[PDB]
């Protein structure tokens, strides 16, 4: 709706958004994964909560930032400074939290 | 595998009259009891056709192709087997190959490096070339085959087509009329300026059997052709004789 392109189909078959269970141990920390070579994943132990919805919007903002600089070289495939990467994902949560 | 033969008995080129040989169907159209005039490459009547003798006579020279060739052979026991075709007659340019073994015929257009003295040797020893680099077309069909066999061939190269006309007649050149029917069409699209016959040598060294062949060149001229009721050519007249 805001103008960012929809994510690729590879995200669906490569990202696990639910806790695997007791048999498999997975990190529940909210982390966005830019593996490179056009591969983007988010490690999510998402629950049905408002925060996880805002956390998801905050973490897609990280990954959505990643496809933006995909054309730039790998060493330059980063934010201009350390503050930009988290800031661009925070406005996503701020806008999604509006009534 | 090349072996140079020095047992040749040198002889100056011979000649004989062509009489009324070399008439072939110029197209594939049926005509009945009509006199039709056509202009195409033809062997002029009563021309001076070269005579080559095989007997110790070993006539395997290289002749120019010009606009066309009329190949005739007074043959028995099938000493003649095939021909070579090309311009530089080596691996530099594309060359054409015609061979007829005891089973069938083999047609290949490759960058052959022919032997200086190509020939064939029961017959189970084929020694006619040394290499084959780029093969662009190959064709296989049925074999073409007292002096009892007369074989007459016509070779043409127009618009990249290699036409072959043949006629087998059971019998110097005899007096009569016999039209030559088309046999095979080859869409090769190369240029040919020289050729060389391939002969089969009998090993029991080697001895050459009783055979002879003639080479005549075609010219563009007008013939008036007479068709019978059944559609075959029975007589013709050379309009410039």
């Amino acid at each position: 709706s805001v103008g960012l392109p929809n994510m690729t189909q590879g995200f669906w078959e490569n990202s696990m958004l639910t806790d695997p269970g007791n048999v498999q141990k997975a990190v529940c920390h909210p982390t966005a994964w830019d593996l490179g070579k056009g591969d983007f994943r988010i490690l999510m132990c998402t629950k049905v909560t408002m925060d996880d919805f805002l956390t998801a919007h905050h973490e897609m903002g990280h990954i959505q930032y990643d496809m933006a600089y995909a054309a730039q070289p790998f060493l330059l495939r980063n934010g201009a400074n350390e503050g930009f990467h988290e800031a661009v994902g925070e406005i996503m949560s701020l806008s999604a939290a509006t009534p | 595998q090349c072996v140079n033969l020095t047992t040749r008995t040198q002889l100056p080129p011979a000649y004989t009259n062509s009489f009324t040989r070399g008439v072939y169907y110029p197209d594939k159209v049926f005509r009945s009891s009509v006199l039709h005039s056509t202009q195409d490459l033809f062997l002029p009547f009563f021309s001076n056709v070269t005579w080559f003798h095989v007997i110790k006579r070993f006539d395997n020279p290289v002749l120019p192709f010009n606009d066309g060739v009329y190949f005739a052979s007074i043959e028995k026991s099938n000493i003649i087997r095939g021909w070579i075709f090309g311009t530089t007659l080596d691996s530099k340019t594309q060359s054409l190959l015609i061979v007829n073994n005891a089973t069938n015929v083999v047609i290949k257009v490759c960058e052959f490096q022919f032997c200086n003295d190509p020939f064939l040797d029961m017959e189970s020893e084929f020694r006619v070339y040394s290499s084959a680099n780029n093969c662009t077309f190959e064709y296989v069909s049925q074999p073409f085959l007292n002096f009892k066999n007369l074989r007459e061939f016509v070779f043409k190269n127009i618009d990249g087509y290699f036409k072959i006309y043949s006629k087998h007649t059971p019998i110097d050149l005899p007096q009569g009329f016999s039209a030559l029917e088309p046999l095979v069409d080859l869409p090769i699209g190369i240029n040919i300026t020289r050729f060389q016959t391939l002969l089969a040598l009998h090993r029991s060294g080697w001895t050459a059997g009783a055979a002879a062949y003639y080479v005549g060149y075609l010219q563009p001229r007008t013939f008036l052709l007479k068709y019978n009721e059944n559609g075959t050519i029975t007589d013709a007249v050379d309009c410039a004789l």
């Binding site: 690729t8 056009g38 | 594939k28 049926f30 005509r31 009945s32 990249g160 869409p187 090769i188 059944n230």
Partner: protein, 327 residues
């Protein structure tokens, strides 16, 4: 009616007593028919498109196509070949147009580099692996090959030339493995500082994006020379129609007439028949070796006998040269 047909020819509304010839009787035509010999000796498209293994982009292969009929409709009919961008010739007319030789070029590249396979384009594949001329008469076919060219551990069998001293010429293959000279110091055969191997292996895996999944690319190059065009498209055969006034196409000849059974004895090599008028009166069907007398649709002159319209209105019709058991 014939009386009005007479008025129409005379360009008048009153007709004097006499006999007038107006028009002719040829049973009108009706259908359109085309016949060609049996479609055999199909070009080996399966051996290239359905090949078990495709070569690397730098070792891009040559497969010349000749002396066969090429059915471009079948290859286009395959659903997986979603990408089909064709250059210099309409895909529809490829089924009919003929060329001397067809060059089939096959290799494997990434999805993002598919756009580099085009005339006037640049890139690592364009400059170092495969350069395509601007005046390119032909076109390419590309499709996803993730299911075949990708392994979970990585399919490293496919390599691309990362570095070269100069851009490749059109239709030029460079398979040299000489160490690239990136600096002024000589390489001396050692891939050290400012010296690296020009070829890099693609690490294709099924867990990549759409732009990085392997894409098998088959490139078709078409050329026309003085040599005869021996690569033709398939020809459609229409069921035979006889004893009717039809338009026929037999091996490229056009005409109109009724096709009837013929008792003529053609020679085995002969195909066409001509009368003393030098007109095609007989023809041999390509599907079945039978001779069809191309009788002109029953044609005949007509003539109307009439008294003056000042006297009466009845007319009589004469068909000269026709036995009227046939009308």
């Amino acid at each position: 009616d014939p009386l009005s047909e007479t008025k129409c020819t005379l360009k008048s509304f009153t007709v004097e007593k006499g006999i007038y010839q107006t028009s002719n009787f040829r049973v009108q035509p009706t259908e359109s028919i085309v016949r060609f010999p049996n479609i055999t000796n199909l070009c080996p498209f399966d051996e290239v498109f359905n090949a078990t293994r495709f070569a690397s982009v730098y070792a891009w292969n040559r497969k010349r196509i000749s002396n066969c009929v090429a059915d471009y409709s079948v290859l286009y009919n395959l659903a997986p070949f979603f990408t089909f961008k064709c250059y210099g010739v309409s895909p529809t007319k490829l089924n009919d147009l003929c060329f001397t030789n067809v060059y089939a070029d096959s290799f494997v590249i990434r999805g993002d580099e598919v756009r580099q396979i085009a005339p006037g384009q640049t890139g690592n594949i364009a400059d170092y692996n495969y350069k395509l001329p601007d005046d390119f008469t032909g076109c390419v076919i590309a499709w996803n090959s993730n299911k075949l060219d990708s392994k979970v551990s990585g399919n490293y069998n496919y390599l691309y030339r990362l570095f070269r001293k100069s851009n490749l010429k059109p239709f030029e293959r460079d398979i040299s493995t000489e160490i690239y000279q990136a600096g002024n110091k000589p390489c001396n055969g050692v891939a050290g500082f400012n010296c690296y191997f020009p070829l890099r292996s693609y690490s294709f895996r099924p867990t990549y994006g759409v732009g990085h999944q392997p894409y098998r690319v088959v490139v078709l190059s078409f050329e026309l020379l003085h040599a005869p065009a021996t690569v033709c498209g398939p020809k459609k055969s229409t069921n035979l129609v006889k004893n009717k006034c039809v338009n026929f196409n037999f091996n490229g000849l056009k005409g109109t007439g009724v096709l009837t059974e013929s008792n003529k004895k053609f020679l085995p090599f002969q195909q066409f028949g001509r009368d003393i008028a030098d007109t095609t009166d007989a023809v041999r069907d390509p599907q079945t070796l039978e001779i069809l007398d191309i009788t002109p649709c029953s044609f005949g002159g007509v003539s109307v006998i009439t008294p003056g319209t000042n006297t009466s209105n009845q007319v009589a019709v004469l068909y000269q040269g026709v036995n009227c058991t046939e009308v």
